[PDB]
Write a protein that binds this DNA or RNA. Structure first.
Ligand SMILES: [Mg+2]
Ligand SMILES: [Mg+2]
Ligand SMILES: [Mg+2]
Ligand SMILES: [Mg+2]
Ligand SMILES: [Mg+2]
Ligand SMILES: [Mg+2]
Ligand SMILES: [Mg+2]
Ligand SMILES: [Mg+2]
Ligand SMILES: [Mg+2]
Ligand SMILES: [Mg+2]
Ligand SMILES: [Mg+2]
Ligand SMILES: [Mg+2]
Ligand SMILES: [Mg+2]
Ligand SMILES: [Mg+2]
Ligand SMILES: [Mg+2]
Ligand SMILES: [Mg+2]
Ligand SMILES: [Mg+2]
Ligand SMILES: [Mg+2]
Ligand SMILES: [Mg+2]
Ligand SMILES: [Mg+2]
Ligand SMILES: [Mg+2]
Ligand SMILES: [Mg+2]
Ligand SMILES: [Mg+2]
Ligand SMILES: [Mg+2]
Ligand SMILES: [Mg+2]
Ligand SMILES: [Mg+2]
Ligand SMILES: [Mg+2]
Ligand SMILES: [Mg+2]
Ligand SMILES: [Mg+2]
Ligand SMILES: [Mg+2]
Ligand SMILES: [Mg+2]
Ligand SMILES: [Mg+2]
Ligand SMILES: [Mg+2]
Ligand SMILES: [Mg+2]
Ligand SMILES: [Mg+2]
Ligand SMILES: [Mg+2]
Ligand SMILES: [Mg+2]
Ligand SMILES: [Mg+2]
Ligand SMILES: [Mg+2]
Ligand SMILES: [Mg+2]
Ligand SMILES: [Mg+2]
Ligand SMILES: [Mg+2]
Ligand SMILES: [Mg+2]
Ligand SMILES: [Mg+2]
Ligand SMILES: [Mg+2]
Ligand SMILES: [Mg+2]
Ligand SMILES: [Mg+2]
Ligand SMILES: [Mg+2]
Lengths: 149, 141, 129
RNA sequence: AUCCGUAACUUCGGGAUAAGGAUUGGCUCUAAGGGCUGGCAGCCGACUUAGAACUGGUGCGGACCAGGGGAAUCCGACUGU
RNA sequence: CACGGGUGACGGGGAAUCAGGGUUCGAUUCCGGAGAGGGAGCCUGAGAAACGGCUACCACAUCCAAGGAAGGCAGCAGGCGCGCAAAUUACCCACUCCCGACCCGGGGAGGUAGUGACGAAAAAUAACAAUACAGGACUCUUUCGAGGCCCUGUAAUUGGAAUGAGUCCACUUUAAAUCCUUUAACGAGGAUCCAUUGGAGGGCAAGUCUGGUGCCAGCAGCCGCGGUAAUUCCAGCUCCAAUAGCGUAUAUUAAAGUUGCUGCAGUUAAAAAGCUCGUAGUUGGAUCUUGGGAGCGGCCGUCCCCUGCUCGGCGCCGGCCCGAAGCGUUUACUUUGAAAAAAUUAGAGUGUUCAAAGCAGGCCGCCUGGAUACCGCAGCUAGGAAUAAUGGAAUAGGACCGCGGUUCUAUUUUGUUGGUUUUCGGAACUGAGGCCAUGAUUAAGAGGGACGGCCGGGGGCAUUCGUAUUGCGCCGCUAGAGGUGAAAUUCUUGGACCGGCGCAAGACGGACCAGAGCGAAAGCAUUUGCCAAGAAUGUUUUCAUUAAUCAAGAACGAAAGUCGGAGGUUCGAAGACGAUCAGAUACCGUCGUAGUUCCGACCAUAAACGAUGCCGACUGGCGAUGCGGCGGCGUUAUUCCCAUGACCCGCCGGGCAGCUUCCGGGAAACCAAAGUCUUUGGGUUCCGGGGGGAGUAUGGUUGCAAAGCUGAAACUUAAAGGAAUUGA
RNA sequence: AAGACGGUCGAACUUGACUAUCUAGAGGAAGUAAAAGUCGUAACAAGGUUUCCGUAGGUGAACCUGCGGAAGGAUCAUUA
RNA sequence: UUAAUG
C-alpha cells in the first residue's frame, strides 16, 4: 500500500544474487569514482548519476564495484548538498503546487495534494532530524521555502 | 479485546471503564439518580402511615380490581401505592395505621396485572398480615 | 504492514495443513521461525525443511505431513513463569498427554517439557499440536 | 487616586468607574528606575514607583475638585436636529 | 488525565462468590491514622495542642437570693429520638496483662454470667419381637396352590425391652455462682412428651381428587389460571422439597462468552466516524556464535571446558599453577536467596466421645509438638543472554603497543642539618610515528524520491460548438389550439396552434455511454489551449526503516438552506385557479415566488451504502474487461521496406467486476471473504449492551439563522427485531 | 502579682461572592398507562401517489410538495 | 375515474 494513495503497486528493482563484478566491465573503481566526481561537479542528483552510469558506462551498481554508494562518495569528497534529494524534490513540488494555488485559489484538489506534500515533507523532516544530517533548528517555512528550488 | 499490544493496559482499562456505563445494571447501581428515585433509599423494608385505600383496575387480558394502600413513609415522606397481598386482608388494614412495606421481588418494577405498583405490605400495626390471614394472632383493639 | 513475521508464517503453514499440501513456501526466513521448525522437527509433526538463502530475507520450504492438527501463535510475547505455565498448558493445549507450547528461554528456544526439565521460564512464542 | 474584584445579557466590540471591599495625614529611612570623562574609577543632574518603622483624641482625596446604585416594562437603534 | 468535583470512600492484613480469569465488600476484636458536639489556643509533663486537663466563641442544657456557679457517655450498663435494623442501670480482679512508692492496692481494659433462630458444628421426635396380609431368589405344581432352610414392607393388633427432654438430692465446675460431664430416686404406647416452613400446569420434585366461587374473590418472581364441569383461587384428603428449619424483601457473586485479558459483536438482530491528513498512544521486516574435545552408559542420552587485567602458598625452576579482593554499556525478561508482623487461607501431627474448634498431649519422672506453603506490585542480591529496546568508529575529538617536549608533584636517595637542578614515577597539555583484513550488514513481493513512455467523464482557468426551449420580428393559410381517464382553469378573426427565415439570453452536454475509467470521498461526459497533480507499469536508480493505525487538531465534503452582487430559458417548494372525492388544504392539469445558473463567503448534514474501517500474509479455478510492460503463426494501414497504429494467441502487477463448487464461515439470506474463531492472540482507531422515553431535557461549544457536536435521568414495557418455511 | 502598648495564632459575628442538594409556582409544552371515545386513513400486497434518508416550505391530523440520493423496489436481464 | 372503515 502507498502512503497517501490507495494503490497497491508492486514495481521496483530486483537486484541479482551475485555481488561480484562482471567480466566485461574493465572500468576500475577509481575510474568509476572519478566519473561520479565529474557528474557531481557538473551538477546532478545521485539518482540520475546512477542512471547515467548504468546506461552509458555499463556499471549497474556502484556499491558492487567500489566500496561505497554514490551519495556516500559525494559525502566523502564534499559534493553532497545541504539537504537530501527526496526532501529537495518534495520541497520543489510543494513550491510548485503553492504557486499553482496562488494562481488558482479554487483548486481544492491541488490544495489537498499540497496538504499531502506538506505531510510527507514534515515526516522526512523529523526523520532527518532524528538521523542528524539536518540541524534541529531547521524548520520548513513556506514563506522562505520558495528561494530553495 | 481488539488492541492486543504488550503495553495497552491503560487503553483496555479506560475503554472498559467507559463501556461499563452503558450496562443497565451497572449505571443504575453506580448513579445516585436511581437511589434518589427509590422511595426506600437503599432499604429493604419501610414503615408508613395508611391514609386511604385504593381499588386499582387491572391490565390487559386479566381483568380484576386489586387492593392497594396509599402509604406515606416516615423516613422520607414519599407516597407509595403499596399492595395488599392476600385474600380479604384489606379489612384488617384501617386508616391511620403504621404498616411495614417491602418490595415484590423484581427490584423496583411493576409486576404482572397491576399497573404502577412496586411494593407490598408485610405487617400491620406490629402484627403480621400472614398471621392475620392464618388466624394465629388478633388485631390489638 | 507486516508486524509479526512468525505469526504470518505459522498461519500460512496452518492454511497449508488445512488444505492438505505436501509442502508450502513461507516467504521470510527468521531465526525464530527456523528454531520453531526445529522444535516441531524434534517431536516429528512436520518433515525435513530447508531454507533458500539469498542475501536478503530468505525463503523457507517446509515438507509437510498430516500429523500437524493446528499450528498456532500467541501474540504478543507474554512472560510465563513456572507457576503459571501449568495454567497456560491447561487453557491452551487440548490435552495433558500431547501438544506443546514452545517459549523462548535463557537456555534457548525449547518447549514447555524441556522448560520444566531445565527450570527456566520466559516469553511465549506460540503453540503447536 | 492605588490595590483587589466585577454579574445577567450581548451585535462578543460592550455592560463597566457594573455591583461589593481595603488604604489615604505627618515625620524618619531603605530599595529601584540615569548622563559626561578616562563588568572599573571619578564628576554631576532629575522627578517618580515600591516597601518599612514611629506618631497624632481613627484623623487623613480633612477646604476645593468630584458618578447614588441595582432589577424590570414601553418607545426611539445610535451620534445629531 | 494535572487541577476541580463526588464518594452511600479511614487504609491494609483479610471476607464472599468462585474452573481458569475476575467482581463486590472491609465501620467491625490485629497494625497504623483521626476525633472526643463544632473549630481555635495553652499550662504541666520525656512524651498532649490531651478534652474521665484547662482557656475563650457558637449550638444544647442545670441551680440561683439575679451578685454568680457548674457540663461534655463516637467508655461500661442504661434512657430519649432516629429508624427495616442491634443486649443487663449484673458479679469479680480469680484467667490475661497494665500502672503505682509496688509480692499486699486499683483497673466497666479484661474475665464470667442475663437477652440472643446474625451465623457455624454436632444432633431427639423411636427401635425390636409376635399375628394378619402384600410380595421376591428355591422345591413342587400345566395354571390355581403348598413347605420354610433365606427374606422385605404395611396395618390405633398385641407385647415388653432401651433411653432422653423434664423434675431433682449430691459432687464437680467457679472469685462466688450458672451451664456441660458424672450420679441416686422419678419420668413414654394416640410413647398428646403430637415438627413445622412452602408448593402440587410448565420452569421445578409432587392429584386432570372432591365441594364452593364464576374475569368476582383472588393465584401468579416468567408464561399464564378464574367469563357456572378451575390439574393454577378458597377449604378437606393425598403427595412433594428441606428438616429445627423454611419462606419473604434488599445489596452483592456465579449464572453473564448479556463488559468479554483469558473470552463478545459491528452487511440484515444495537453497531465502521462521509472521507482524508495528522501529534501524543500502540505496533513495528531480515541480519552479529556455529561447533569441537575429554569421561560414562546402551548412532543416541548425560555431565565438564572454550572471557581479560592488587594481596599470599601444594609451591616449583624472571617464569608457571591455585585461592582471595576490585573493574569490566544499560535494562526489560527468567531462576535462586534474603527481607518479608501476627490473626486469616491450604496444610503436618493430635480421638475436644465425632465435628466446628484448640495447640494440645502420650507412657510406665520421662517423651515430645506448637512445622511448612502463599504473601500480589515495587526495592536488594547472585547465575543466563534465547526475545524486545539501547549505543560504539563515518567532518576518525577511534582504540591498541611504544616515544620526544611544557607545567605541577608521593618522595626512595647524597652519614645528620638547607637551596638549586636531574635519574626515576603520578596528573594536565602537546608534536612525529607503527598497526587494525583498519572501520558504513543486505536493500524487505516495506516505504519515500529521481527517470522513461504512457494512461485517465480526476482538478482549476480561458475559449469554442451543438441542439432544444421560451420570447420577439416578418410571411402563408386558418377555427380551433393546450391538457386529461374525461373535462375545465389558459390562449384564440386583436390570427391561437402549425410551417419557413432570422434575432434573443440563460441552460443542458442525449444517442456514442458500458456492471467501463479517474478521483480520498462528495463527484466527474462538446472541442481546443495553458497550469499543477496522480495511480499502475518499466528500472541491475537513490535514501536505508524513513513504516501502519491514529485521542486533540486540520483539509475537502451531494442536494437543500443562509448572506452579498450578476442573471433569470426551462422546471419548480410557497401561493392562486380548474378537476376528483363525502371531504383534498394531496395525487391530475394551468400559471407561478424562493430556488434551480455564475462569483465571493457560511452550513457540515444524506439509504454520504459495499448498510461491509485501514495496512499486512495465506488458502480453488474459469471466461473477460481497463491500463502498463514482455513474447509469438499470421491479416490490415504509412507504401518502397525496417520500425510504429488496428486485429489474433498467450505471460505478469492491481483496477472495478462476473460465473462456478461441500475450501471454510454464518441464524440463514449469502460471502474467496462476511474464510484462515471454543483447534478462540498479525497490528491499530471508532462504536453497541432488551424495546421506548430520546438523539429528548440540561450544561458547554460552533453558526447570521436553520441547526451542527457532546449528551442523560425520571417513568413505562415482556417483548421489540433479523433470516427462513407454510397458509391467507 | 494586677494591668497596659505592640506582635502572632486565631474561635466567633455581620456583609458579599461562588458552588452542591431539595422544593413552591400562574401558564406552556412532551412522554407513558386504561377506554365499549371523535375525525381521517399515513404505512404493511405496486396498501391503491412504491418505500426510505438528508434538507426547506405548508397544511386539523397522520402528512403533501420541491431538490439530491438509496433499494431495504415490483427490474440482478431487453437485443444492430 | 372512483373505492375509506371493522
Ligand atoms: Mg498513513
Ligand atoms: Mg447595569
Ligand atoms: Mg413585552
Ligand atoms: Mg434618539
Ligand atoms: Mg464525603
Ligand atoms: Mg466517610
Ligand atoms: Mg477496616
Ligand atoms: Mg487526640
Ligand atoms: Mg455525641
Ligand atoms: Mg482537646
Ligand atoms: Mg467521657
Ligand atoms: Mg481519654
Ligand atoms: Mg437484629
Ligand atoms: Mg486481675
Ligand atoms: Mg494485686
Ligand atoms: Mg468491655
Ligand atoms: Mg418433637
Ligand atoms: Mg390446592
Ligand atoms: Mg411450579
Ligand atoms: Mg413435574
Ligand atoms: Mg401455581
Ligand atoms: Mg454477574
Ligand atoms: Mg464463565
Ligand atoms: Mg453480546
Ligand atoms: Mg442495523
Ligand atoms: Mg463507511
Ligand atoms: Mg525484530
Ligand atoms: Mg502473615
Ligand atoms: Mg453530446
Ligand atoms: Mg477527531
Ligand atoms: Mg451545495
Ligand atoms: Mg443552493
Ligand atoms: Mg442569492
Ligand atoms: Mg411550469
Ligand atoms: Mg382545489
Ligand atoms: Mg400541481
Ligand atoms: Mg451521520
Ligand atoms: Mg453507515
Ligand atoms: Mg474472538
Ligand atoms: Mg438500549
Ligand atoms: Mg402478558
Ligand atoms: Mg432495521
Ligand atoms: Mg401505480
Ligand atoms: Mg393507505
Ligand atoms: Mg389515495
Ligand atoms: Mg403508498
Ligand atoms: Mg412500498
Ligand atoms: Mg399547497
Amino acid at each position: 500500500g502507498r502512503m497517501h494513495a490507495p494503490g497497491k503497486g508492486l514495481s521496483q528493482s530486483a537486484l541479482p544474487y551475485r555481488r561480484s563484478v562482471p567480466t566485461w566491465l574493465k572500468l576500475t573503481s577509481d575510474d568509476v569514482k572519478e566519473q561520479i566526481y565529474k557528474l557531481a561537479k557538473k551538477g546532478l542528483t545521485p539518482s540520475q548519476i546512477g542512471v547515467i552510469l548504468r546506461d552509458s558506462h555499463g556499471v549497474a551498481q556502484v556499491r558492487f564495484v567500489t566500496g561505497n554508494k554514490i551519495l556516500r562518495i559525494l559525502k566523502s569528497k564534499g559534493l553532497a548538498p545541504d539537504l537530501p534529494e527526496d526532501l529537495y524534490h518534495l520541497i520543489k513540488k510543494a513550491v510548485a503546487v503553492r504557486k499553482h494555488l496562488e494562481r488558482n485559489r479554487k483548486d481544492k484538489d491541488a490544495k489537498f495534494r499540497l496538504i499531502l506534500i506538506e505531510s510527507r515533507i514534515h515526516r522526512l523532516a523529523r526523520y532527518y532530524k532524528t538521523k542528524r544530517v539536518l540541524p534541529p533548528n531547521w524548520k520548513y517555512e513556506s514563506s522562505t521555502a520558495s528561494a530553495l528550488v | 479485546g481488539k488492541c492486543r499490544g504488550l503495553r495497552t493496559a491503560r487503553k483496555l482499562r479506560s475503554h472498559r471503564r467507559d463501556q461499563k456505563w452503558h450496562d443497565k445494571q451497572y449505571k443504575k447501581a453506580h448513579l445516585g439518580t436511581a437511589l434518589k428515585a427509590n422511595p426506600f433509599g437503599g432499604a429493604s423494608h419501610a414503615k408508613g402511615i395508611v391514609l386511604e385505600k385504593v381499588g386499582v383496575e387491572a391490565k390487559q387480558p386479566n381483568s380484576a380490581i386489586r387492593k392497594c394502600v396509599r402509604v406515606q413513609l416516615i423516613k422520607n415522606g414519599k407516597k407509595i401505592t403499596a399492595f395488599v397481598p392476600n385474600d380479604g386482608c384489606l379489612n384488617f388494614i384501617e386508616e391511620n395505621d403504621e404498616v411495614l412495606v417491602a418490595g415484590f421481588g423484581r427490584k423496583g418494577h411493576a409486576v404482572g396485572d397491576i399497573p404502577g405498583v412496586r411494593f407490598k405490605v408485610v405487617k400491620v400495626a406490629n402484627v403480621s398480615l400472614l398471621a392475620l390471614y392464618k388466624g394465629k394472632k388478633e388485631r390489638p383493639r | 504492514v507486516r508486524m509479526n513475521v512468525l505469526a504470518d508464517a505459522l498461519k500460512s503453514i496452518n492454511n497449508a495443513e488445512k488444505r492438505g499440501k505436501r509442502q508450502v513456501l513461507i516467504r521470510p526466513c527468521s531465526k525464530v521461525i527456523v528454531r520453531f521448525l526445529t522444535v516441531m522437527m524434534k517431536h516429528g509433526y512436520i518433515g525435513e525443511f530447508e531454507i533458500i538463502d539469498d542475501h536478503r530475507a530468505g525463503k523457507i520450504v517446509v515438507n509437510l505431513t498430516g500429523r500437524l492438527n493446528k499450528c498456532g501463535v500467541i501474540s504478543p510475547r507474554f512472560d510465563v513463569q513456572l507457576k503459571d505455565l501449568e495454567k497456560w498448558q491447561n487453557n491452551l493445549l487440548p490435552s495433558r498427554q500431547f501438544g506443546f507450547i514452545v517459549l523462548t528461554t535463557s537456555a534457548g528456544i525449547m518447549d514447555h517439557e524441556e522448560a520444566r526439565r531445565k527450570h527456566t521460564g520466559g516469553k511465549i512464542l506460540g503453540f503447536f499440536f
